[PDB]
Amino acid sequence: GVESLNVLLDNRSSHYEEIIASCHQGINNKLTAHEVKLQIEEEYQVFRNRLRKGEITGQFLKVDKSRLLNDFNNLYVDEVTATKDNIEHLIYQFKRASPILRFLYANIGEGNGEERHHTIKECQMQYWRSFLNKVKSLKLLLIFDALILLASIHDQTRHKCSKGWLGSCFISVNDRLVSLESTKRDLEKWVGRRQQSERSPPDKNQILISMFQKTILKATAALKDVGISVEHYKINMEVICPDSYDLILNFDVSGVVPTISYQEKFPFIMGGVELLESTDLERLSSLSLALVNSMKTSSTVEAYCQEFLLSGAEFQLIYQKTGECSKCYAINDNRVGEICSFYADPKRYFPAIFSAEVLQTTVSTMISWVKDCSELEEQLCNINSLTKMILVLILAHPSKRSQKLLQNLRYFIMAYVSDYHHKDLIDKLREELITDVEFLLYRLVRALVNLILSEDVKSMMTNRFKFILNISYMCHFITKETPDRLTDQIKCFEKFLEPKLEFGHVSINPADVATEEELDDMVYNAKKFLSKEGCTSIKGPDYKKPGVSKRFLSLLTSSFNNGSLFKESEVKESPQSYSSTGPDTGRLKFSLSYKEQVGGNRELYIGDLRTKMFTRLIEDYFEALSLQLSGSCLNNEREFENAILSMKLNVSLAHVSYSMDHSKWGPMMCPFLFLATLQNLIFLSADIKGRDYLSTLLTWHMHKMVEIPFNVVSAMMKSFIKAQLQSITEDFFYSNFQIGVVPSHVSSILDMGQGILHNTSDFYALISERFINYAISCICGGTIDAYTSSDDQISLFDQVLTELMQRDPEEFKTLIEFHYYMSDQLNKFVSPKSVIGRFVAEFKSRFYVWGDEVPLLTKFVAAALHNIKCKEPHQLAETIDTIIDQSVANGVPVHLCNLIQKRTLSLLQYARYPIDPFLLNCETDVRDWVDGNRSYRIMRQIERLIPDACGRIRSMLRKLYNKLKTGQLHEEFTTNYLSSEHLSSLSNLCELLGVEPPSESDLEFSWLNLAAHHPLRMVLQSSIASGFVGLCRTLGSKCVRGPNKESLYIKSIQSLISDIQGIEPLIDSHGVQYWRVPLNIRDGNEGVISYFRPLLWDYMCISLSTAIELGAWVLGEPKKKHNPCDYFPLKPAAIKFLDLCVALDVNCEALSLVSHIVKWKREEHYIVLSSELRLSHTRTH
Ligand SMILES: [Mg+2]
Ligand SMILES: [Zn+2]
């Protein structure tokens, strides 16, 4: 489609020629392989001589550990008036630093007696509440309030229980907090007025009962329509008394009133609970569940309350506003009100709801790493306290500044174990802290760092490196959503506009028909961009300024044309006219947005369909050109494996390594650079017409327009109209408003699309790094390798430079300086987070050392925790299965993954959904992830459920597999078995061979399968909490499609099942349900036995499909100080059968064995702990 341009006209004026002239002005791309070394050596001599004097700065320092520690200590020394805290003071003032932290450690409910045993029995008030809440969801509210009050009175006058009141108020129906006396007066007035109306014989003590009977009759009539009975609710009709009006009109309750404080009052002790136990994570889970449930309340078109029980006592959480936004919460108790009041956010509190044994196991497995040390065995009780405190603090107060504070520790711990580092590093690990909890977090982190990385500890460096590198990945535990949306759109525009005001080129309104001023400005700025000088001048190099010099561009193009950079094997509606500024129907337009990240943020450009069509041509061209060469890893797949092998070898040999990053990659490149580079290359010497079309496309990209967001302009206009009757981004809008017209679009020469022109940037990086390495090898006597991903890079040195680093340090530092300068001379800026060393190597967030391996445990656990959505409950299981399968292959133990699976099953059980044996298997081991797949795990679960019935089936399957692998019967089977009855076929199938048929007592095992006629309805999120709320709301409305055409409930089906005294349920330990259904009642009732499916049929089918996919070992019979750092690499077990596979697929609506090969990808190689490969099962042939 690239050549399609030839169908258009050609209206190119004398503007398209000046750009080519400027890009061809003073560049010499015909030099020879002998005249470049002289220039390189002259530059090196001048630079070295000028640097030895003192007229150029060094930008690099040698690593000294004492200076690094003493600079990390007093990093915030203006507010923290201390130098060395004691751990006892920290543990003391940790449990008293907030209301939420005071509540998690107080001595609440000091006496738990029979009033704590009564909280398991269900009174009548809650039954009536549930019934009326159900009825309401299909004058009025007064009757419901009166019924609730009557139920409460009848519950109190029997066994003296008071659970549903708060002083004088009482939660009645919609979490409301209606008063008491007001209802009495309302009922009095209502009954009086009704009697005065009906008068012109009865009493006020019978009209109420009449209305009660009418209302309950209408309700029970409307509720029996859908199919739900009344026995499910277990309500007692005796709550209504013949004397009910004068029973209500005399009640008397007294207590303590609640309140909310919108601005030493704590009524409990402060430091009861310890830290070694697990008493606070459960309280946190309960409080978080209440805070998330507080988003269900309806708009009502006041006071709302939620309830939770910790240790048999009952607490209430009250609020005064509905919706999903920040509000003020208060915690109350029926003994004394107003325990505390805070200002939390309803979201951001998901990751700790049912996960209290996973976090304890995470801490316990992280601490066992540094346990063999001898310099740490005395103070091994403080590390536990500090780790647990950091975790709990991160979970209780989710902030955006703590995330960056914890993320910045990775670069410190990386620079601590290196040889050289950038001098401007400490100024980067400094973020603005505001509140009083972030300073406490910093002090805890500092105490732990100074405790672990001491000076008299020199035993095991790799374990401590792993430990410290794992405390910095605890920021993934918070969130990646945004606190406020109107501020990030301001920060994004600030980032967009800041670097374009220093260069001095900004166009306000292009008008889509450019004037002469814009063309002259473009020409002038294109000439200014190519006028950078350095190292042969008066001043010298001006670091961190956009531009390229003609000398190095000439050298690069000449060296590419010679053939010095190649390897050994590398040398073998439709518009009609177009100008140099765009098509006839307008220039290219883009819009701005941002993207969510852990840490900062990242811009995003969005275009319409025509520009998306036009950009793909350049993208494909440059991707093909980059594939022709070798060295890039952005889209290739063998290059990444080669890079990993080279990194492993380099680290094993103890050579030098250089891990780099480049800053401001996006907003510093430009399409003019790519144009000027492309115009000076000779490829093979029709194609020149392709080069012309490419130049035209890049010229179109050079004149694009970006649209300013609307909220920012509105905010600026309001701020101006307010302050009139302050930054560089403010004076722009101010001086534009002061003279009328307002800004809407922006155009300039100094920005490429972030995430748009990736592949051309990768190509440019490839060739530039090749040239730089060539020059460096030319000067000295050593060589270098390189691998790029368009903003990341690793460099592996050789033996010569490794020895030169220790024999002549000054020449090594001078070579590093020359590399930095020569790289800056080509529009590439090395970041202050790059390192040179011999202990570790890093590339694409992958770390490699010698003697151990570095798994990122906390990252995977955090990624697995909050990963749920509002989908069908049979697709979330596959997502969790895939995540856990990917995480086991890196070094996470399986006993920590079984707990995550149990957590997911508990999340599903809370929403009142039945659990079938086709969801998860929380009893696996190593061999179920290395050798088998999902189908093998489900087979193992079914074999665990019902043994003594899977042996004969396995023998029949073995004989059938032996008979089918030769071709004796391939059609006698797949035509009158897979399309017949399920139960009356297996008998004759096993009779056909010489095996005992399955017994009549094994064919009753069945399982319940909703969506047996049509898939259940889900659509009728912007956050995970809203996803969980919507999931809990959807399962419970209809979510069922009946046989002909209708909608049902999940409770009606279970009621109908209970209406038959011939079926049995059976539940396992984890909570898996399977039924026993006989074969005589199976007939006669055809309306509700339409949902059950037999088990042995699905078992046979799935087992045969797995035996066809994997080997023939799955049909056999099953049979059944170690330090935490001992790893071993493992590899998995690796037409005419595809028709049989597709046949066996559609006959079982349980799994999708063929989808796993189209959507998902396998794992290449595993690494596992050697202590878990001992305990395992083995299946032979
Ligand atoms: Mg890197
Ligand atoms: Zn009771």
Numbering used by the authors: 199 to 336, 344 to 405, 410 to 472, 477 to 514, 533 to 803, 1102 to 1214, 1219 to 1258, 1266 to 1560, ...
Article excerpt on this structure:
The large (L) protein of LASV is a multi-domain molecular machine that binds the conserved 3′ and 5′ ends (the ‘promoter’) of each of the two viral RNA (vRNA) genome segments (denoted L and S) and plays a central role in the viral life cycle, which is entirely cytoplasmic. The L protein contains an RNA-dependent RNA polymerase (RdRp) activity and catalyses both viral transcription and genome replication. Transcription is initiated using a capped primer derived from host mRNA by a yet to be elucidated ‘cap-snatching’ mechanism involving the intrinsic endonuclease (EN) of the L protein and possibly its cap-binding domain (CBD).
From grids of the apo-state, two different 3D classes were separated. In the second class, denoted APO-RIBBON, at 3.73 Å resolution, the EN is not resolved, but residues 822–1110 of the L protein form an extended structure including an α-bundle (α-ribbon, 843–884, with a third helix 907–925 packing against it) that is not visible in the APO-ENDO structure. Masked refinement of the common regions of the two apo-structures yielded a map of the APO-CORE with an improved resolution of 3.14 Å that allowed a more accurate model to be built.
